[PDB]
């Protein structure tokens, strides 16, 4: 099928600014609108990254779109956990260099409990001493972690790409052994990936609610998000989504 991990390290999108206006009142609507603007810019980076991801081009265009649309929240949350870990040792939520959430911002954004759920993932990065190599492979696995209930147009091609990145993750964990054993670390990483589905389910519930009442709440959505959410919301709410778990329940 195929160093794919060294390609991943080099194609990682550069950090972008939120364009946060600290002179404007820190209302839930202003903070959420800033976060949405930032997500729109990061989704453009995600698409550019996916385009040069080894093996992604082999999948048909319709499947590439499906995968990006189902996984967008997972990818954004996982990268936020990484930035939080790398730049603050997971003390804060590092959305961007100009937008770092402390307890005050978590309360002001009206998303305190969701932010705490996210902060718990970045704390697991500290516990595990997650490496950049592990992180990049895991992020590809998240892009490939949600499919339609009736599967993709090219299901076999998708499964081949997914299997090969799981093999890459298993090869990578050998570099961080305890005794010299690495099976333990592999299952700690797959448990971590599986736990992203429940956190993302809660983030999407909040997102969809704000999307359905955006003008009433004074929350703005960039075009990229309008397009993604408009397609994803009826698919997710009708149960057409299928999260792929390494370890059931």
């Amino acid at each position: 099928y195929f160093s794919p991990v060294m390609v991943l390290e080099n194609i990682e999108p550069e950090i972008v600014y939120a364009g946060y206006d600290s002179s404007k009142p820190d209302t839930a609507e202003n903070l959420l609108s800033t976060l949405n603007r930032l997500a729109g810019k990061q989704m453009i980076q995600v698409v550019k990254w996916a385009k040069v991801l080894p093996g992604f081009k082999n999948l048909p265009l319709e499947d590439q779109i499906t995968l990006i649309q189902y996984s967008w929240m997972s990818l954004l949350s996982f990268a936020l956990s990484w930035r939080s870990y790398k730049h603050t040792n997971s003390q804060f939520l590092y959305f961007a260099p100009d937008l770092v959430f402390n307890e005050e911002k978590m309360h002001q954004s009206a998303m305190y409990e969701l932010c705490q759920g996210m902060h718990q993932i970045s704390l697991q990065f500290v516990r595990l001493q997650l490496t950049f190599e592990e992180y990049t492979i895991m992020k590809v696995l998240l892009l490939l972690s949600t499919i339609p209930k009736d599967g993709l147009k090219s299901q076999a091609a998708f499964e081949e790409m997914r299997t090969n990145y799981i093999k890459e993750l298993r090869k990578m964990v050998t570099k961080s052994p305890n005794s010299g054993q690495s099976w333990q670390r592999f299952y700690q990483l797959t448990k971590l990936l599986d736990s992203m589905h429940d956190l993302v389910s809660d983030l999407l519930e909040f997102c969809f609610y704000t999307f359905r009442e955006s003008h009433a709440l004074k929350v703005e959505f960039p075009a990229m998000l309008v397009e993604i959410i408009s397609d994803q919301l009826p698919k997710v709410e009708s149960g057409n989504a299928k999260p792929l778990y390494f370890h059931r329940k």
Binding site: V47, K48, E227
Partner: peptide, 10 residues
């Protein structure tokens, strides 16, 4: 073409 289609095909 949607924004995603344009970005993926350009």
């Amino acid at each position: 073409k949607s924004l995603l289609q344009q970005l993926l095909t350009e």
